[PDB]
């Protein structure tokens, strides 16, 4: 690593000393001649005439190819080893606004199609997950997501959000409890499996808990007869065939700060069913009549994509 | 082996198998046996919601697509996932209700504007569905018939005020 | 990648500028001297005499070995990474008349001995299949053949034919349904396992369905007593011991267009049992007497290899 | 390996011979010119004028790039092969004061946080253990720890201590019996699992036998009612919350050699409960009143970390 | 591969043509100057003065580094790919007096300690066998030993002997039947497991059949009472504690050709119990009195290692 820098400095001290005291040349000439000889440039303006001096140069040339054969084998030992550790995980994340995904399933593959590629780091331990992650454009970190020593290789202290979706609810609770020991302020989004563990995923410290098997178990048992609410959930939340659930923010200015929901009358102007308003980490589903809008709010509503355009200009100034 | 389970002449068949390959292949086998039975499948990937309908499923439920889109939308804001979690999964305050219109009960022939449902009951009328077709956001030029189903979101104190409002 | 091109252009701007304004040499000389110095050629016709100029050249030489050490480590990071992704699958097919084989069994190994090597791409996911495919002379693409995102890495839109032979009939139906979503006109040849799924492999969109376990199950149960039809199937279709089933085309001209099968009388002239005629994606097994031949037909028949030579000249003009 | 040294010596004999007998130059000039030509230095003071001599140099130059293309491919065949064997185990330990760990579990991961990294070699055979060992900073040797031919690749004859912790007690007894066949004087620390095998691990030759499942099984069954001894074991031996079990040595001089334990009176001076004294591979738990201290003893005691400082100065001169 | 040879020949045609027709130099000078410029030697006796000629050389120099960057990336694509196929099996045996070992167990590990290392090729398919074979000094060929297409990668047609020891007796019979289809004259040594398959291993074509579980099953059931024949088998055949079973050949001359076994009287002279004589692929255990020795025979006997020395000089002339 740095023994190469000494040996390169050794042959400049062997060579310069040899040239100056045999040819009688200057110190600035003896430095200049050694640097065009080790580098195999060789202008030939200051060649050595004496047969002792001709035997000196041969020694310097073999030490020229000598140190260019120790520096090459140290570079190629560095590059084959670094591209092997980088390939099979085994590397430390250095980024600072990335998204870490603990575990890998279909629900995390579906959230890679709405995120960037090089921003996402998948921390898993299986060997088949490594080839699925590299095909999808994310980066693979090899580690146990429940072990706190391996949650720091993924750099979850300087991350934008962490997404936990593991094989059990035992590992999901234990991965949330380990992230909250490192960084108490990072955003954790977690997937529950059983209905009994939605409360234990929140007490462990998840900010958003999503339970897909409990939603899908209710829609299965309520579609045996008619299935009208399963058509609503599938066309608005899953496929977005004709409707879409949007959240739009109210900016500064915004032409409506202060009026009630009755005087604003967003539905009959626009055509968007207003569900609720997002006043700062709470959700008021069906706000009452005398709710007055503020700045920085977020309006959640269902509407056609040609009606959201009629809304996003209605609230902008 | 699907005839040992007697899928011919049943209320519904619910298919949820270990892969999407076996969920499609099970629906193609039920349609060999009974063409008219109700099949409720579960899609795992997004690309197979259309292949499960062409195979013959009457209702496809894709939970990994709903959960996948709510994960990539809750990195910043997370107000959409709060609504889904509290009316579809947990039903903590509000829940989705479907109530049918009985025969000769205060609503046969009235328009939606003077039905006045959101102001006398408090329930958010999401849509009305008649005959396996959901009319989300019914317009003011719409009338109620006996047999329609009102799909709404409301509190348990408000849902029972609706079910008395739709009675004779 | 392209930061190397800037840094190479940087030292030509550092060097040329240094040479011209110290030695007083021309602009075309200062460009020529820098290119024989970075490349370590060094003719020595335009060497720098001044001791400031001799200290300049040393700086240029270290920047010569500097950029030849960043360009080498970027090439070797490119080559070790590219030969590692190419080795374990993980690469995109770019060809346009290739044959894609989804899955791998003995029936697909038997159709590699009648095809080329570099024309065939095997799309599978197992790790033991990768070493069997590389031994046989085909190319391995790592992917799930049922996933439509991995059927496009194998480039099945610009393929000659696709051959589906997977572990279940569940995966074979689901791989056919995924190819027909990409390209509706490509040719799909599929292998059925159970008799109940021959009709579902055709409705999913396979052009040719082969059911080997249904042929082999009928020959087993009809050889307990005598086994005369199992000798016919084995010597004509499997081994080709003395007979062979051929299809010969009728070309343009062809000396027989228009005559009936009775007047042509192919059997007693040649010795080939005529099974049927291939008039354009249909097969008329045992055509009647007043069937008249056309051009572009295909004649299917069983005969000895010294009787097919007596046939292929009988229909050629 | 050494055929390269002959071929390099071949072209110096081809070249020198060619230069001397065509140009008529000296023997010391013909040696000097060949070494600045193969190395591509090329001063150009002794260039060859004759058109036969110009055709000679071209041959020497192609043999210059010839042997620099066999020496590079032999180096790169050496480096890719050596970094592949070193990566997956497959290498011989050459150190002489290292610590060998046979097997890998949580109890050996906990003794890596109190040891160095490059001093520790983990000898195992699993493929998942290799990635856990490389993450922790130790070195992985691939081998069966029960096989005596693979205990010598880990160099357990010149080791500081060996730590055996394997999957069974069958393998732990068989690994101890194999180390004692190689080096009878090395220190073996072994982990027992069942209570019946503590005596067979000592007769096989372990110097220290630790049985964690027998300690943990007694504390579980004696904590159903009150659990006061399980609080002592957890706060002194496991966590070191407020107390710690230390061993301090008595040096030469030491101001106390010769006095009894009653006259020294270590507890009421310091505050450390004296358990026992380590007189040379024996432990006298609760020594009697007329035990006289010597030099080179070791005092085992429990105390707060602000009381061990009051002890380590009390016994030092 | 050979497109590099064209491109190297391209720039000699670009360069020579450029030099001759601008500088007006000779054809033998223009060839000589291009070869000292592409190779970066650059004597500088024939430098180009004209500013058009100085712009020509720069183009030739970039094409010099151009083709030395396509030749390096083709060499390094060749070496990383060849050392990867050679590492994981995947290579063809080219030797002609080697020993092929189909399968791998303890009985084949015990016959590697009496054979050479580079003479032995182990043909197996498991991934853990590859690391055990590389540790022992043999070479690993990846293949199925029952498949005849993979028995030819191991080159069993030009082998000294083949040793079959597989996981079943089903695979051992099927590997012998496949070797005898390739080379009918090669020597096959096979290991049986059940007593019923010793006859099927000989009819399939093994030259020597060894059945270790049938020998060990008889010695177990005949050592319950006394165990005197199990001491004989263990000390002569397995350990060679004090006795050894040797075969010595009778050479030409040999001082004893023609005499009977009674007149030769080998036991009371030497001390070696004579078991039998090996007259040409047969074994006469306890030859009768009037058996006369010949040349080229082989004498099988049990004796101490200080009695075999008294025998090997008694039969030599
Ligand atoms: C003389 C002037 C040389 C200017 C020096 C060049 C270093 C540039 C850095 C690029 C290498 C990428 C970084 C490699 C690096 O620094 O890692 C070190 C070890 O590897 C190393 O020793 C890398 C070796 C550094 C010296 C190699 C220089 C010639 C290599 C190519 C031959 C020319 C063709 C630390 O662990
Ligand atoms: C100066 C004139 C140089 C003429 C330039 C040479 C490029 C030839 C292309 C052959 C390389 C194969 C293609 C490599 C390539 O282009 O990939 C790029 C990155 O890799 C790269 O930067 C490849 C590095 C290109 C520059 C390396 C030139 C000297 C390398 C060998 C030293 C001589 C011995 C893009 O991602
Ligand atoms: C001429 C004067 C040359 C002075 C000779 C250089 C050897 C330095 C040793 C460093 C190499 C690391 C040790 C490599 C080694 O010795 O292993 C041998 C085989 O590999 C070998 O043949 C290694 C090849 C030794 C000769 C390679 C010299 C030029 C390589 C780089 C080209 C310059 C850029 C034995 O198995
Ligand atoms: C100009 C005169 C050159 C004399 C030519 C050198 C070839 C020596 C053979 C040693 C290489 C080992 C054998 C490599 C080989 O021939 O395989 C071919 C492909 O690889 C190849 O193209 C190998 C490339 C052959 C040309 C590379 C020469 C310079 C490489 C190193 C740069 C110097 C440092 C066939 O598939
Ligand atoms: Cd999950
Ligand atoms: Cd959504
Ligand atoms: Cd499913
Ligand atoms: Cd099959
Ligand atoms: Cd055929
Ligand atoms: Cd243990
Ligand atoms: Cd302790
Ligand atoms: Cd065996
Ligand atoms: Cd023996
Ligand atoms: K030069
Ligand atoms: K020169
Ligand atoms: K050079
Ligand atoms: K040069
Ligand atoms: K290189």
UniProtKB/Swiss-Prot annotation, chains A, C, D, E:
- Keyword presence, Nucleotide-binding: no
Xref: InterPro entries: K_chnl_dom, NAD(P)-bd_dom_sf, RCK_C, RCK_C_sf, RCK_N, Trk_Ktr_HKT_K-transport
Q: Where in the cell is it found?
A: Cell membrane
Residue intervals on the Cytoplasmic side = 77-87
Where Ca(2+) binds, per the record, is at 165, 191, 193
User: What remark about domains does the record contain?
Assistant: The channel is composed of 4 repeated units, each containing a transmembrane pore part and a gating ring part. The gating ring is composed of eight identical RCK (Regulators of K conductance) domains, in an alternating arrangement of one domain from each of the four subunits and four from the intracellular solution. Two protein interfaces between dimers of RCK domains from the pore-forming subunit and from the intracellular solution hold the ring together. One is called the fixed interface and the other the flexible interface. The flexible interface forms a cleft where calcium binds.
Q: Which GO terms describe its molecular function?
A: identical protein binding; metal ion binding; monoatomic cation transmembrane transporter activity
Function comment: Calcium-gated potassium channel.
Q: What is this protein called?
A: Calcium-gated potassium channel MthK
SUPFAM superfamilies per the UniProt record, alphabetical: NAD(P)-binding Rossmann-fold domains (SSF51735), TrkA C-terminal domain-like (SSF116726), Voltage-gated potassium channels (SSF81324)
> Mind listing the UniProt keywords for this protein, alphabetically?
Calcium, Cell membrane, Ion channel, Ion transport, Membrane, Metal-binding, Potassium, Potassium transport, Transmembrane, Transmembrane helix, Transport
Q: Which residues form the RCK C-terminal domain?
A: 233-317
Protein's organism: Methanothermobacter thermautotrophicus (strain ATCC 29096 / DSM 1053 / JCM 10044 / NBRC 100330 / Delta H)
Which Pfam families does the record associate with it? Ion_trans_2, TrkA_C, TrkA_N
For the Extracellular compartment, the record's topological domain ranges are: 23-29, 46-50
Q: What miscellaneous comment appears in this entry? A: It is not known whether calcium is the physiological ligand. Inhibited by charybdotoxin (CTX), a protein from scorpion venom.
Q: How does it assemble?
A: Homotetramer.
User: What topology does the record note for this protein and the membrane?
Assistant: Multi-pass membrane protein
Question: Gene for this protein?
Answer: mthK
Q: What is its main location?
A: membrane
């Amino acid at each position: 690593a740095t023994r190469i820098l000494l040996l390169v400095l050794a042959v400049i001290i062997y060579g310069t000393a040899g040239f100056h005291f045999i040819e009688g040349e200057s110190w600035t000439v003896s430095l200049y001649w050694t640097f065009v000889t080790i580098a195999t440039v060789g202008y030939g303006d200051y060649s050595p005439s004496t047969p002792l001096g001709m035997y000196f140069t041969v020694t310097l040339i073999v030490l020229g190819i000598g140190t260019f054969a120790v520096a090459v084998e140290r570079l190629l030992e560095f590059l084959i080893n670094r591209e092997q550790m980088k390939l099979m995980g085994l590397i430390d994340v250095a980024k600072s606004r990335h998204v870490v995904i603990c575990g890998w399933s279909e629900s995390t593959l579906e959230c890679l199609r709405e995120l960037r590629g090089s921003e996402v780091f998948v921390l898993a331990e299986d060997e088949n997950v490594r080839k699925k992650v590299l095909r999808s454009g994310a980066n693979f970190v090899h580690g146990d997501p429940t072990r706190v020593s391996d949650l720091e290789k993924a750099n979850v202290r300087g991350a934008r959000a962490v997404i936990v979706d593991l094989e059990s609810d035992s590992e999901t609770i234990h991965c949330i409890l380990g992230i909250r020991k490192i960084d108490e302020s990072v955003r954790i989004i977690a997937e529950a499996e059983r209905y009994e563990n939605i409360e234990q995923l929140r007490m462990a410290g998840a900010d958003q808990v999503i339970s897909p098997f409990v939603i899908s178990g209710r829609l299965m048992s309520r579609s045996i007869d008619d299935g009208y609410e399963a058509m609503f959930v599938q066309d608005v939340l899953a496929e977005e065939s004709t409707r879409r659930m949007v959240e739009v923010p109210i900016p500064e200015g915004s032409k409506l700060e202060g009026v009630s929901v009755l005087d604003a009358d967003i539905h009959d102007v626009t055509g968007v069913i207003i569900i609720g308003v997002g006043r700062g980490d709470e959700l008021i589903i069906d706000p009452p009549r005398d709710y007055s809008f503020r700045a920085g709010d977020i309006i959640l509503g269902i509407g056609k994509p040609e009606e959201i355009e009629r809304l996003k200009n209605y609230i902008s100034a």
